[PDB]
Structures are given as C-alpha cells and as structure tokens.
Design a binder for these strands. Structure first.
Lengths: 5, 103, 99, 93, 82, 99, 82, 93, 103, 6
DNA sequence: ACTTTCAGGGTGGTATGGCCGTAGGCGAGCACAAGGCTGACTTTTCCTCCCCTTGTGCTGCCTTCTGGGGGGGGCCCAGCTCCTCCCCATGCCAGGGTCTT
DNA sequence: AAGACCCTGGCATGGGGAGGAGCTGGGCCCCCCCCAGAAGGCAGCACAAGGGGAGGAAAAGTCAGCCTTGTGCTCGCCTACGGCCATACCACCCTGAAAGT
C-alpha cells in the first residue's frame, strides 16, 4: 500500500 | 478530529508537540513544527519497515526480528549513512567475505 | 586415517556460520565477571542490572567485530591472510583510538 | 509504579500500512522505538542550534525543514521534506 | 570476582569474534592483543556509566547508564531504551 | 657535471621545511576559484566572505595533511615508502569516509 | 567558463601537502586521487555552509557558516569565531 | 548598537598571571576565544543532559562537576574539579 | 566587590551566568553553577597559556602566535585528547618523522 | 604568580 | 577617554528540591547437574619472510614562460538598524477522548 | 476491558517577527606589472614487484575434563512513590560602574 522510492 | 488525522499522519502530532515544548529546544514552538517533525518521523519509520519486511520475506519469515532491521539498514546506503554510528542489538553483521581470501 | 579437510575450508565454513548468526559469541558469566571486576576499581559495592551487563556485552562484541574487520583490511593490504598484532595497532591508530 | 509510553502503537499502525501480513517481535519493536527517539533528538537538537544562530526564540517548520536537510543524506532528505511539507499543508487547510 | 577475569575471554571466544569479522587466519599473539583492546574499551564505557550512576545518588548501574555512556562515546546502541 | 643530490635527501629537506612552517600550501586564487565553482552547483549568484574562503582553505589543508599522515602509515605497513592510491583508499575506508 | 578549476590544485601543491604529512615518495597516480578526495570534502562542507546561508535568507557565505558546517561535520576550526 | 562578546580581557589577565612578560597575537587570541566558547558549550550541554536525565529543572555546581568529570580526561578533570570546588567554597564563604 | 573577585577568579562570573541562563540549558541555574564553570574555564585557559608561553620561550620568541598554541596542545596528551577533533588555524603540524624514514 | 602541575 | 548598558543588591513569591516513611521488587548468593564447550597434544601443510633480479617509474636539475599576488580605484548590491503593528504562541479553565495496564 | 489523564477547544494577552525605509560596507570587478613558480624534458637510479625456497607456526582432529547455564529458593537492600516543608531562584525596582570603540 505504502511506497515512495 | 485529532491533530494527526488532520495532517494525515499515523504518528502522535500532539505528543511530539508536548515533547518539543518539554525539551526546551526553544522558548516557543510553532504550530507547524510538530506536524513537520511527525511526518518526517513517520516517513523514516515507514521507509525502514518496508525494507525490513522485505528482508523477512526474502528470509521466508513472517515476523520482523532485529536481524531483519540490520539487513535493511546496512543494505540501503542512504539509511547506512544516517545510522553509521548506530549499533543494533542482536543484529549481527552483513554476510560478506573478501574475494582475495576465497580459493 | 579419517578424512581431514584442507586448512582454510573449515575457516571459510566458520566465517559463513558466524556471519549468518546473531548470537553472542562470548560466554555470559566470564564477561559479567570481567565487567564487575573492572567496575569495582571505580566504586565499591556496585550493583548491575541484567540489561546493563547485556548492553555492555553487545556493545563490546560489536566493537570487536568492527575492529576485526578493519584489521582484516590492514592484513590484506600487506599481502597477507594472517592477521597480526601490528594490523590491529594500525587499524586503531587510523581510527583515532591511538592517533 | 508509573506507566511508560513510547511509539509502539504508531509503529504497529505504520507496519500494517506497508506489510499487512508481517508482524514485529518485542526486541525489534524496542529498536524501532530507540530509532524514533534518536532521530527526534537529532532533528530537534539541530533545529534548536539553527534557531539560536539566527537569534530566534521560536522553532518553526522552517527550522525543522532545514534540520532535515542538514541531517538526512541524499534522497532521504528530498522525500522527507516533501512528506513534511505536504503534511503541514494538509494540516493548515 | 577479584582478578584474572580477563582470561574469561578465552581463545575460542576471540576466534568466533574474528570469524564474524571475516578473518581467515589468526596469529597467536592476536588473542593477548584482543584482550587488552577489549579491556580498554570496557574501562572507558564503565567509567562513564558509573559516573552517571553516582550523579543520580544510586548504587545500581542501570541499562540507561550504559546506553548514555555509549552515546557519549559516539557508539549509539539501540534496543535497550533511549 | 654539477653536483646532484642523491634521490631522497631532498625529500627529508622538504619534509623538515614544510613541517617547520605553517603557511598555506595551496595557491589562494586557484582554491578560491575551485570553491566558487563547487558552490555554484548548489546555489547560483552566491557571495563569499574572504574569511569564509580562508576557513575553507584552512580546513581543507589540515584535512589533507592528516589524510596524508594516515596514508603514509598505510604505506609503511605494506613495507613501502611510495604512497599509492590504494593506501589513500585504505586510510579513508578505515576512517569511515567511504561507508 | 568556471569549469575544471580542480586542476588549480597542481602537482607541486599536493607534494607540499604530502611533504607536511611526512611522505617521501609519491606515486604518479596520487595527484588524481588527492583531487578526487578534496572535491568530495569540499562538496560536503560547502553543501552544509550554503544550507545555513539560505536558512538566514542571506546571499553571502559568512565565515561562521563554514565553521558551523565544519563543526556539524565533525571537525572544529579555531580562529574564525565562536 | 550591537555588542561584541569576547574573553579577551580575561585571557589577558590570565596570561599576565602565568607569563608576566609574554604577549599574545591577534590571531592567537582569537583562538583562545574559540576555545573558551567551545569548552563552555561542551560543559553546559553536558550539564543540561545530566539535569534532563534525572528530571531536574535546575543546573547546579554538581551538574557542572559531573560534566567536567565526563569531558575532561585524566588529571585534567581532577585539577579542574579541585579548582572549581575551591572557588565555590570561597564564593559562599 | 564583584562576583568574580568574591570567588577569587579572573573570568567573569556574572557574564557566565547570563550565558547559562540565555542558552536554554535548563529552566533554572543555581547560584554556584556560574562560579564553578568560571573556575574551570579559567583553569583550562591558564593551562594552555602556560604551555603555549613556554613554547615561545623555547623557540626564543616573546609573543604567542597560533603555532605555539598548537605545539602546546598536541604535545600534552591530556590536552590533545580533549581537543582531538579540533583544528588550529595557522597551527601547522608537530614536527615528527617515522623511524623507518631515516636511512 | 600562577603555576600549575608539572 | 565616556558612557550607557550591563553589574550588583534587596524584596516578594512560589515552585523545586530535600528529608522522612514505606512497600515491594529486583539484585546477590547458594545448591545441583549434565553436558556442551574448553584446553592440551600431534601432524602437517601452507603461509610468511628472506633473498635476488630487474625494469619501470620516480626524483633531481634546468629552462622558460605563465599566472598568482600585490597596488590602486569604482559600484552597487546586500546586510544591518529602527518603527510599526499584526498575528501567532502561551496560559488557564473546562470537557472528553485515548491508550496503557 | 476500564478509566487516568492529557489533548483539544475557547478566550485574553503580551511579544516577536515581518514589511518598509534608510545607510553604508565590503565583495566584486577591472587594470597593470612583476617575478616566483609551475610545466615540460632529460638523465639516472632506486624501489616496487615477481619468482623461488625454507621453516615454523597456525589449523585440524582427537580426547579428557570442567565450569556454564538452566532451575529453584532465600534474603534483604535499594528505589520509586507520597507527603511536609524549607529555601533558593526568578522577576522587578533601584542604583552604580566598566571596557569598547
């Protein structure tokens, strides 16, 4: 669900 | 709605503000300072937890242990620089052997 | 005669085994006795939490493992595989522990 | 004896966001708590010095943002600043 | 606990520490060098931990006294509070 | 032919001369140009106090002198007198700069 | 244009820095290595010094910004203000 | 009208105490200023942390004494502690 | 008299008190805290100045320059340990050459 | 008039 | 050398810290076992240390041209200071939701 | 699951910082000239590096012994908590002098 890089 | 809900965070915006005021870092603490700090702390924690969870899945495990946290930190050069002088208790070392020592 | 491994293969096996693990590599009772023997020179009749001795042991072991990695680098530098006391001394000198 | 409070509840919430089916042990959770405390003291301590350099009696989000830039290396600072700026914008709105 | 407790850091114990560090061959004079290096490190941390404890008018060296002594040494340790 | 000094004694002469003195060993204008060029990559149209560039030069030269001392130690370890890039790399790696 | 000024750290200048460090014999590949080391060190301090400067909304890098950037880097410089 | 803070007068007095016939340069004197400002910040920062750990709201000569013990090595701390207690005893008496 | 002279020092006890109060170290500062700190700061200064002044006399000089401070600091093992990560501008280095150096 | 330890 | 901004003193108040008393909980100490880890002995083999030889790379001396460094002058953009006042952070009372046992 | 208490809301308030105007200071830019030093080159030689070989000191295996560690119990000293109360520190008014330009 959560990821940035 | 709690202050964390307004900022969209899952971290204690209110408690961080109490920590900032209690720590006498300055005579006064702005309104947006706890929101900025809580967002940074949550982002950093989520960054490690995603990396540590990936290590556990690589080690075909369904639970995070301090060894998994150590693998995530040392593998990522950005977190490795941030935590260069940090010791993780029961974390072990990165498995690495020098090539010249191998047969 | 029984089968005997050539030297070095068992060393590599031990390297892999102890780099795959996270256990404490020093016996807890002798280390605790050493910690209490050192501390008694500062204040007599001290008491130690269990977590205090455990933190001391973890810190000491991490420090020693890092120092041994630096010593291994110094040994490889001099075209060697055997680590010698001078390698430890050089690693400590560059690290600043002896400047 | 008094009760002790830490970030255990919030770390569980963040972990559930990234990995729904992964738990965290007791010893790992203690390390995560020590990590949050360490970074908080680093950022606040740098923002305290940063505000005192400018003869400022207030710590604002500008002080935190610059403290983040000074401490976080590389792309860690870039993404943290955007997350921090986005959160403050949503908070005021 | 009176004397000669440094020998409790036995030769096999030091060898296990070196193996974790990737060392293949270990000289016979290393073990005495490793014991002295460990003792110096322990003395530095314990002197700071006991100093913290004496300030708080206590007799029990808490785990936080060790954590604070290490942070002073520049050797931050996670997992024992903070 | 005129007298020619044996290779090496001029090195000790220069070592003594440059360890007795405390002057900056890098020309000021090239270093100032270098500092202005590096800082251009961060923010454009910057300005530098004279003491700012002086402080940068003092810090850089002290750092380089210390690094060369460590490199010389690494060279002596490997049974050599000529310092090589691998010596610099080992000194930096033990110092923790390479990470 | 303001490019390739790192060659202004000439071979004789690096030899002077090496001579103050006790070096006698210097390999020919050292000069490229020393220039790469210096650029990394300068990039680190200048990045933090400018960060202090833009925080105060200033345009001139003061001597005290450099001191602050160095001190936070780990190296403390005496003689330019405190 | 902004003031300039320095210990130049007091370093001069101390220098005349130890070395009656020796002066100090302008650059060397600015080094002594940074040294006093540096050590003041170290002891004050250490005393601040000691008071924070024991949940104390005040900084006392006992916090300063322990900070001196933690920072100054060897015989430096023994003589610094002795000098400080001698001054405090004289100050109260 | 003055607070400095009552304690018998030369450093400003009054000036130190303001810096401790203004610097945001604690909510309160004791009566003896500035007096103790001033005594320590004066002692550390006198130790360096005595050692640096001796360096000038041995170097047949009469005025202390930054080089003399560096020679005194690095020659004393206690002062060197205290100021290990400190750079003295225009201080040079200690003249020392290895044993394998000399033919 | 102010000497210290040796 | 003058001053004016900071050093020093006295008083009210009160919030912080010391002293006594208490209860429990953790730290030190003592049995017991059993066995997993340590210490010593032998063999050997493989790494280290020494010697030699050489070719390449470094040093040292010379020559010459370039550019760092010093003087002298001019601009102007940027940095410091004062007035104002408007808006944000703090403190206190009241309520109610949360997160720790 | 319960509830202790800390976070949020609302309002009154003193003060901090942000805009505006103004002054000026040194950072930058230019120009000229000199001579100290860097760059290129050539001769010489000394040092890094490869190859070879002896020996001795680590490693690996075997086996006997011991002291670590897990379990269980006792004692009692220390530490966090709570209440009472001294008292030392902060703020304000007032007066007076000291070192920095």
């Amino acid at each position: 669900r959560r990821s940035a890089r | 709605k709690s202050r964390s809900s307004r900022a969209g965070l899952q971290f204690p915006v209110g408690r961080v503000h109490r920590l900032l005021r209690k720590g006498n870092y300055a005579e006064r603490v702005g309104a947006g300072a706890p929101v900025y700090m809580a967002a940074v702390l949550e982002y950093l924690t989520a960054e490690i937890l995603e990396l540590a969870g990936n290590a556990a899945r690589d080690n075909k495990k369904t639970r995070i242990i301090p060894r998994h946290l150590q693998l995530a930190i040392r593998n990522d050069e950005e977190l490795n620089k941030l935590l260069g002088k940090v010791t993780i208790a029961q974390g072990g070392v990165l498995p690495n052997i020098q090539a010249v020592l191998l047969p | 005669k029984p089968h005997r491994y050539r030297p070095g293969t068992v060393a590599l096996r031990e390297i892999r085994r102890y780099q795959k693990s996270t256990e404490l590599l020093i016996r807890k009772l002798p280390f605790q006795r050493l910690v209490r023997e050192i501390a008694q020179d500062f204040k007599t009749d001290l008491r130690f939490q269990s977590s205090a001795v455990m933190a001391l042991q973890e810190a000491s072991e991490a420090y020693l493992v890092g120092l041994f990695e630096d010593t291994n680098l110094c040994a490889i530098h001099a075209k060697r595989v055997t680590i010698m006391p001078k390698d430890i001394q050089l690693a400590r000198r560059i690290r600043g522990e002896r400047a | 004896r008094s009760r002790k409070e830490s970030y255990s509840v919030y770390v569980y919430k963040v972990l559930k966001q990234v990995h729904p089916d992964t738990g965290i042990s007791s010893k790992a959770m203690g390390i995560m708590n020590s990590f949050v405390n360490d970074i908080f003291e680093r950022i606040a301590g740098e923002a305290s010095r940063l505000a005192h350099y400018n003869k400022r009696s207030t710590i604002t989000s500008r002080e935190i943002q610059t403290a983040v830039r000074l401490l976080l290396p590389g792309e860690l600072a870039k993404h943290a600043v955007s997350e921090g700026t986005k959160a403050v914008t949503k908070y005021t709105s | 606990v009176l004397r000669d407790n440094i020998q409790g850091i036995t030769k096999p114990a030091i060898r296990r520490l070196a193996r974790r560090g990737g060392v293949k061959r270990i000289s016979g004079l290393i073990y005495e060098e490793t014991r002295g290096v460990l003792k110096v490190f322990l003395e530095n941390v314990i002197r700071d931990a006991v100093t913290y404890t004496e300030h708080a008018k206590r007799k029990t060296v808490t785990a936080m006294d060790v954590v604070y002594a290490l942070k002073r040494q520049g050797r931050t340790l996670y997992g024992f509070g903070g």
